[PDB]
């Protein structure tokens, strides 16, 4: 989901990135189941 | 010749007018205000505002 960092760029700029949060953090310093199948 | 006093009565009628002004608003904002075209996102409210 786009949230709190891609939000502003998607709104004003026009682009968005999947992991923009980690990019920004880097440029500045900062359940299972069991089914029946055949193997 | 002498003169007697004079009296008189009179009436004035009103004049009537009116004003006007339009205020048209859009359909997208109408549906975004009520919630009819809302969404569960972080991008809907950003435009409802």
Q: Could you give the C-alpha distances from A25 to A2, A7, A17, B29, B36, in angstroms and in order?
A: 16, 16, 14, 36, 38
**How many Å apart are CA A33 and CA A37, to the nearest integer?**
12
**How many Å apart are CA A13 and CA A5, to the nearest integer?**
12
Among A25, A12, A14, A18, smallest CA distance to A3 is for A18
User: Left, alpha or beta for B9 (phi > 0: left; psi -120 to 50: alpha)?
Assistant: beta
Confirm or reject contact between B42 and chain A (CB < 8 A): yes
Resolution, angstroms, 1 dp:
4.5
The contacts of residue B47 (CB under 8 Å, 6+ apart) are B32
Residues of chain B contacting A2 with CB distance shorter than 8 Å: 42-43
**How many Å apart are CA B25 and CA B22, to the nearest integer?**
10
Q: How was this structure determined?
A: cryo-EM
Residues of chain A contacting B48 with CB distance shorter than 8 Å: none
The answer to whether B17 touches B29, Cβ cutoff 8 Å, is: no
């Amino acid at each position: 989901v786009i949230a709190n960092t891609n939000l502003v760029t998607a709104l004003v700029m026009g682009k968005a990135v999947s992991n923009m949060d980690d990019v920004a953090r880097y440029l500045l310093g900062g359940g299972s189941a069991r089914v029946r199948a055949d193997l | 010749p002498a003169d007697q006093p004079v009296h008189n009565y009179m009436i004035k009628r009103l004049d009537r007018r009116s004003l006007n002004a339009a205020f048209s608003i859009a359909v997208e904002a109408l549906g975004l205000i009520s919630g009819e075209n809302l969404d569960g996102t972080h991008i809907s409210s950003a435009m409802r505002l």
